[PDB]
Amino acid sequence: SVGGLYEIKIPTNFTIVGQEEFIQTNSPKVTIDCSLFVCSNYAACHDLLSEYGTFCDNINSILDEVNGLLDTTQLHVADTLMQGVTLSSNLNTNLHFDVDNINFKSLVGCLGPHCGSSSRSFFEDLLFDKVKLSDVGFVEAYNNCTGGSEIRDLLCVQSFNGIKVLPPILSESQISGYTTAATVAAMFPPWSAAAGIPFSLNVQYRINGLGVTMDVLNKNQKLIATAFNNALLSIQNGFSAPNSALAKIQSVVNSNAQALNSLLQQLFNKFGAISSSLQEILSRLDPPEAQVQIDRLINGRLTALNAYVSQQLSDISLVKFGAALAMEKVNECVKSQSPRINFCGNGNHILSLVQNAPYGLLFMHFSYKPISFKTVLVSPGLCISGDVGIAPKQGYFIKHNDHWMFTGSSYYYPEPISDKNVVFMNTCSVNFTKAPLVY
């Protein structure tokens, strides 16, 4: 420090940067028909498998519980998106899609049931079209297993062996309806998801809270609004190229497909038997030796199912904690701006928005980003008049025109010292810069 002053780089210009965050809230509801997987339709295998008693009932019961937890979690996520959402019945998203120079039309699908399943936003369409095995993807894939096509879809081989993914209780179209409602709730009165005020004013007050004077924000409202809509466009254009959030969404589908393929491959393991085919055993051996070979297949396949079910329990615990985090981000980053620094993504978090994604939610975090900086000598406090101490609120004291002035900590704009930007102390601390002539 020179005198009582320190050198600090204070921003002189800024932009808004958008950052994506995919949070997995759901997973494919895998169901296994244990006796159809273990034995298919060979009566000699079903006779032996019946002697294992409750083993298949346990496998079925654990997966039914895991799937019930996924269903309960999806309802709790949907409830969180819709909580407190109040909208005007006059809202018609074909006309009503930009406000205060901020354009929302890519984030808002058609509102109300009269449009059918088309409530998916342009941004959600742009994300769901890059993932073949969405909920509707699995339904369409299974619809083709009896279509008579020459294509040997691996999902048809899996489902005929009793491995089938059931659709979630709420369609991804309904969840995009709920993210659409939660999004328009922020941009129009009563602003039920934007603290009850116009979205541009919420953006402005959030940037001001970072220590940016209101004067530069309310004169640069066009620049802030265009920086916000450019940040959103940069997020959308970012999906046309290698992207960590898109890769995370695809990794959910790829890891499920890998686990289901690995489980189907266990039907071809011999487990030390003469063949993995029950037809080959039953066409080579008599009942007493065939039983010895079939029992090896039953033990291997039941062990494979037990290993798969144990892994599935472990993986859905991560999905439950991921959904809990997504709900916390909806409540503390989207519907409100909780005073937690790196919770809603990195940097100077302004505000966050949410959109539906295959098996999760895409959060868009908007952050205040310094473009350029001025090195300046700052005082963290002043000692004034009758040795009264003053500390700057969210800012710094600055010598400008050889006079003591205040600047916000996130934007260099010298303004006069006043009770609006000061914390008073009845005695000043040691090392506070002596300024007897102030106020």
Partner 1 sequence: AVYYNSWQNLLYDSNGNIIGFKDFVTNKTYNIFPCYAGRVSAAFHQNASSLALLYRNLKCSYVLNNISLTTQPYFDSYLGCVFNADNLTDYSVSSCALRMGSGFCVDYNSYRFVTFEPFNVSFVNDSIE
Ligand X SMILES: *[C@@H]1O[C@H](CO)[C@@H](O[C@@H]2O[C@H](CO)[C@@H](O)[C@H](O)[C@H]2NC(C)=O)[C@H](O)[C@H]1NC(C)=O
- Under the criterion CB under 8 A, does residue 162 sit at the interface with partner 1? yes
Question: At its nearest, how many Å lie between partner 1 and the CB of residue 38?
Answer: 13
DSSP 289: H
Q: Which of 51, 5, 79 is nearest to 404 (CA)?
A: 5
- Under the criterion CB under 8 A, does residue 174 sit at the interface with a copy of itself? yes
Q: Which stretch binds partner 1 (CB under 8 A): 124-132, 165-173, 296-304, 314-322?
A: 165-173
- Under the criterion CB under 6 A, does residue 101 sit at the interface with ligand X? yes
Q: Which stretch binds a copy of itself (CB under 8 A): 32-40, 118-126, 149-157, 323-331?
A: 323-331
**Beta-bridge partner residues of 31:** 164
Select from ligand NAG, a copy of itself, partner 1, none the partner in contact with residue 342, using the beta carbon and a kind-dependent cut-off of 5 to 8 Å: a copy of itself
- Under the criterion CB under 8 A, does residue 154 sit at the interface with partner 1? no
Judge contact between 166 and 67, C-beta under 8 A: yes
Is the alpha carbon torsion for 290, 296, 299, 300 positive or negative? negative
Select from ligand NAG, partner 1, ligand X, none the partner in contact with residue 101, using the beta carbon and a kind-dependent cut-off of 5 to 8 Å: ligand X
Question: Which of 170/223 has CB closer to ligand X?
Answer: 223
Backbone angles phi, psi at 56, to 5 degrees: -70, -35
Strand bridging mode 388-392 / 382-384: antiparallel
Question: Which of 133/264 has CB closer to a copy of itself?
Answer: 264
Q: Which of residues 166-205 bind ligand X (CB under 6 A)?
A: 200
Judge contact between 45 and 298, C-beta under 8 A: yes
Question: Which of 28/381 has CB closer to ligand NAG?
Answer: 28
- Under the criterion CB under 8 A, does residue 153 sit at the interface with a copy of itself? no
Judge contact between 182 and 81, C-beta under 8 A: yes
Strand bridging mode 388-392 / 422-425: antiparallel
Task: Select from 33, 100, 295, 328 the one that contacts ligand X (CB under 6 A).
Answer: 100
Q: Which of residues 394-413 bind a copy of itself (CB under 8 A)?
A: 396, 409
Select from ligand NAG, partner 1, a copy of itself, none the partner in contact with residue 62, using the beta carbon and a kind-dependent cut-off of 5 to 8 Å: a copy of itself
Q: Which of residues 235-294 bind partner 1 (CB under 8 A)?
A: 265, 268
Q: Which of residues 300-319 bind ligand X (CB under 6 A)?
A: none
For residues 170 and 80, give the distance between their C-alpha atoms in angstroms, rounded to a whole number.
14
Question: Which of 284/340 has CB closer to a copy of itself?
Answer: 340
DSSP 402: T
Backbone angles phi, psi at 399, to 5 degrees: -85, 115
Strand bridging mode 382-384 / 29-32: unpaired
Interface characters, 8-37, with partner 1 (x: CB under 8 A): -------------------------x--x-
Q: 10-46: buried (b, 16+ CB within 10 Å) or exposed (e) per residue?
A: bbeebbbbbbbbbbbbbbbbbbbebbbbbbeebeebe
Question: At its nearest, how many Å lie between ligand NAG and the CB of residue 371?
Answer: 5
Judge contact between 60 and 168, C-beta under 8 A: no
For residues 197 and 202, give the distance between their C-alpha atoms in angstroms, rounded to a whole number.
6
- Under the criterion CB under 6 A, does residue 223 sit at the interface with ligand X? no
Tokens, residue 359: 């098996």
Tokens, residue 104: 């929302």
Task: Select from 19, 121, 173, 379 the one that contacts partner 1 (CB under 8 A).
Answer: 173
Binding site for partner 1 (CB under 8 A): 33, 36, 40-41, 71, 75, 78-79, 81-82, 85-91, 96, 135-136, 139, 142-143, 145-146, 150, 152, 157, 159-162, 164, 166-171, 173-174, 178, 181, 188-190, 265, 268
Binding site for ligand X (CB under 6 A): 98-101, 148, 200, 221
